[model samples]
Target: EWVNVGSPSEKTFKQRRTFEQRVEDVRLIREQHPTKIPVIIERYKGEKQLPVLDKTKFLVPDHVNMSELIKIIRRRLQLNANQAFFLLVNGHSMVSVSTPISEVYESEKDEDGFLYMVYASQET
Candidate 1:
């Protein structure tokens, strides 16, 4: 089949919307669900290890920590424990994972207001 031009999977998510529009969605999200943290998750830029993901956006509960966030991502992928997962926070290791989403969002969130994460598999 021809290249799938419509998948925001590669222009990625932020490129399509006006920064103004991007910020609007985040602004409203915080206003409505004050307890949630808006996050965007995707697979590693290249790989044959994982399946395509459908919803790239997530509104995660801020009460939880990075471990929980990773758990949610793993669950979304139906990833088995045998797989070695690498979750990146802005292309860096997801260190100090005990930190809550609120704090992580404050420090690592994107310019447009959403926290971003990308995951990859290191093993089959």
Candidate 2:
């Protein structure tokens, strides 16, 4: 249920378009496919070494946990197997890797229905 598509802009995905635009897109997406969750991911502003995601939008399955999602993103970023980074949600790394993202979404959802996340390395 997860898919990646080209981004609208290189900056923060939220700012790339109006909240109304995102709301319309997110609304229709959930209505058509209620099994997936809308997510918006981007690089941490202070981050430099890590590359950016060409596709910021993702419709991820409801069953996937935080760690599994991280692996998917890591593989796409082409980071070494041993390489590590922080996936911050509201200024903190999630305490449970096994936590379902649906749970996170229930609480972290944005006004436009996009679950925004920022990935950053240990260096910054």
Candidate 3:
């Protein structure tokens, strides 16, 4: 039992795509294009030098997630469990572990058509 004062009812509430739908859409686009997305990773200022010799250009698959990407980066850096690192996009926000790489790239790629990420060691 409910009453409304000349307002729309809940039954007409708008519908929006779920997170799964958005993920699938991004995945579908990525599947259509087999080329990996170009990624640029940089060491945060005043942080220790990057473990790897090069700090540029990493080509990552579109369907990759932040967690998997983090593991790949950690392996490349030869990091031990004791070492803590933070990965950020555009030097600002940290993407969630479950976020699809393609979606992140789509939303945040820079002027040079690259997804730029910055990493740094966590403060003690």
Candidate 2 TM-score over all chains jointly? 0.85
**Candidate 3 per-residue lDDT over residues 1-124, each given as its tens digit:** 6874543321210113354654554466557666677676766655764463255557688899889888888888788977878777876655478988888888898543547777787532
Please name the candidate that would achieve the greatest TM-score relative to the true structure: 1
Cα lDDT tens digits for candidate 1, 7-122: 55467677777899999999998999999998888777786788768889888888899888788878888989888787788887776989888999998888889888888875
lDDT values of the candidates? 0.82, 0.84, 0.66
TM-score of each: 0.86, 0.85, 0.64
Model 1 residue runs over 4 Å out of place are 1-9
**Candidates in order: C-alpha RMSD to true structure:** 4.6, 8.1, 15.0
Clashing pairs in 3: none
Error in Å for residue 63 of model 3: 0.4
Tell me which residue pairs clash in candidate 2: none
